Amino acid sequence: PYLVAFRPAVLVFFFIRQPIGAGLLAGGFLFWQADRHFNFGIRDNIHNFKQTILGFPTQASKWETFKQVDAQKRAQLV
Amino acid sequence: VSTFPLKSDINITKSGKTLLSVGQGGRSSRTGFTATVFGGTGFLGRVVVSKLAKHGTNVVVPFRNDRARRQLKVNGDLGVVNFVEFDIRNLKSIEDSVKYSDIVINLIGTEHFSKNFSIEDVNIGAAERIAKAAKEAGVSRLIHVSSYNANPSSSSDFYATKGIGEQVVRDNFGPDATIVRPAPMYFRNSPFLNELLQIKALGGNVIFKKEVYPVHALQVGEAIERIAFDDATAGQTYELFGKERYSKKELREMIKHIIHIGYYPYSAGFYLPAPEPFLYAFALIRQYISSQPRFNVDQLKRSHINQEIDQSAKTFTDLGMVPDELSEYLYRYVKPHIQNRTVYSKEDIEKLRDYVNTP
Ligand SMILES: NC(=O)C1=CN([C@@H]2O[C@H](COP(=O)(O)OP(=O)(O)OC[C@H]3O[C@@H](n4cnc5c(N)ncnc54)[C@H](OP(=O)(O)O)[C@@H]3O)[C@@H](O)[C@H]2O)C=CC1
């Protein structure tokens, strides 16, 4: 609970000490906070790019895997 | 200074008073004068007052701030430095500081208009009242200080009012008055340098591209002292400036490099490119919200105007003094703000100046 009290002081001292640097790191922080608020889909797609290149099981691959299982089982009944 | 400032022990003023100086020029010596230094509590006054008192001239210093006049009494002996409370709107208090005065010096001059005074009301209204009132009391000599770029027709408020200040005095005090134009002086807590040392200087590129002819404030302090004791220098116009030409942006990087101030200049706020409307808007907004004198709209225009030498005026050598260069004194006056200290000598300022100009 100590940071909640110390947060008002340090944020003030971040803009006073390094005003140009403060306007970016705080400004950049608000972008991603807004991005998740507004479902911009950016950080999600930056994430999906990494999982594709590094061979991870992506979200799209699982849903494609379900389609292959779904399409196979349905024709098995016929 | 040296040992005794007066050229001759007995000096007769324009009013017929015969003043005899006594002593060998020490603190306990006298000169028989009474130099009222208006605006003595300011940056320039504290040098004008100091030199006059140590050599035995009575100084009457009219003040409006009570706690700033205390330190002026150290310079003189007992009774040498006198005080009068006044305001430019109180005519009677003006006549208290000129009744016994044989020398009257005018230093009052502002760059920012306040909720009680405008730029004209001080560079003219104060000067006109001060000059005219001094004459009626038989003051022998008047000395005045104006801008270094006085011009009656200039679009800058400071330069326009300061120029009219020259005319309105000579229509009030008369032919005896003298006008001295000082270039931006540099000294301890100099307003000329205090803008260069400030880390958060918004519009630093725009403000510092102006050009100047910096002059050592001590010499101007003695320049008035030389003029004060001489009657040969009535009715003249003097412009005092330094030989080597310097620009603020040349100084600002030269100043910063001595203080050694990688990533820091890009972050702390050394270079703040801001739009021209924003600078104009910011100065206007603070003009109604601030309580201390900030950057003004007038200094936004002055930044586009370079210093001009007027050939009708007279230089330092007219008084027998050789002006000193900013190179020999720039380091020591920022030495407060700076393993093994590197002392940037007179010649080595050029080598610093070389390093600034090299891209
Ligand atoms: N190197 C420099 O400083 C520069 C010199 N000049 C000019 O030389 C002149 C000397 O001024 P300087 O000392 O250098 O700087 P300052 O502004 O500090 O001098 C101001 C002096 O005049 C007084 N003053 C201003 N307005 C009023 C007013 N309404 N009523 C009474 N007194 C007032 C001040 O009183 P107080 O301080 O007690 O309130 C102070 O004594 C100025 O006109 C200046 O513009 C030109 C460019 C720069």
Side-chain angles (χ1 to χ4, degrees), chain B residues 22 45 48 61 136 150 219 248 263 266 322 328:
Chain B
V22 292
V48 177
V61 184
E136 286 164 299
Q219 291 186 298
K248 301 181 175 180
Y263 82 104
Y266 321 149
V322 181
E328 205 190 36

Side-chain angles (χ1 to χ4, degrees), chain A residues 16-21, chain B residues 264 266-269 272:
Chain A
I16 287 187
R17 215 67 177 95
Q18 307 190 26
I20 276 77
Chain B
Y264 197 70
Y266 321 149
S267 178
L272 283 160

Side-chain angles (χ1 to χ4, degrees), chain B residues 102-119:
Chain B
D102 299 335
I103 302 177
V104 169
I105 302 175
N106 197 259
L107 308 177
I108 307 185
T110 176
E111 313 182 3
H112 332 78
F113 75 102
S114 60
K115 69 190 170 315
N116 281 343
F117 311 95
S118 65
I119 297 192

Side-chain angles (χ1 to χ4, degrees), chain B residues 70-191:
Chain B
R70 304 179 330 197
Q71 71 179 34
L72 285 174
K73 197 172 180 64
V74 160
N75 321 276
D77 194 78
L78 289 183
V80 170
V81 187
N82 306 267
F83 300 108
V84 173
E85 191 188 20
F86 95 112
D87 214 353
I88 64 177
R89 292 166 300 181
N90 185 289
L91 179 64
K92 161 65 192 306
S93 61
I94 305 177
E95 301 189 334
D96 267 349
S97 296
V98 301
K99 192 180 187 63
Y100 305 93
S101 305
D102 299 335
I103 302 177
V104 169
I105 302 175
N106 197 259
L107 308 177
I108 307 185
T110 176
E111 313 182 3
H112 332 78
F113 75 102
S114 60
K115 69 190 170 315
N116 281 343
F117 311 95
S118 65
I119 297 192
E120 349 111 358
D121 292 15
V122 174
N123 316 25
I124 307 170
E128 168 182 345
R129 195 155 298 184
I130 285 168
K132 185 182 94 68
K135 175 191 174 171
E136 286 164 299
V139 168
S140 48
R141 282 296 305 278
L142 170 62
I143 306 180
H144 207 293
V145 170
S146 63
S147 55
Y148 43 88
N149 274 311
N151 174 25
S153 65
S154 185
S155 68
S156 166
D157 308 340
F158 182 70
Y159 291 146
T161 60
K162 279 292 195 175
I164 301 184
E166 297 186 349
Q167 308 172 356
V168 66
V169 160
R170 296 191 172 282
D171 312 0
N172 287 255
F173 191 83
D176 308 0
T178 312
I179 304 168
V180 167
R181 302 201 179 117
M185 294 156 297
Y186 59 96
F187 196 61
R188 302 297 317 279
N189 192 75
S190 167

Side-chain angles (χ1 to χ4, degrees), chain B residues 3 25 52 65 71 93 96 166 169 191 208 212-213 255 277 295 323:
Chain B
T3 163
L52 290 176
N65 183 17
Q71 71 179 34
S93 61
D96 267 349
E166 297 186 349
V169 160
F208 298 154
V212 283
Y213 280 91
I255 281 178
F295 191 82

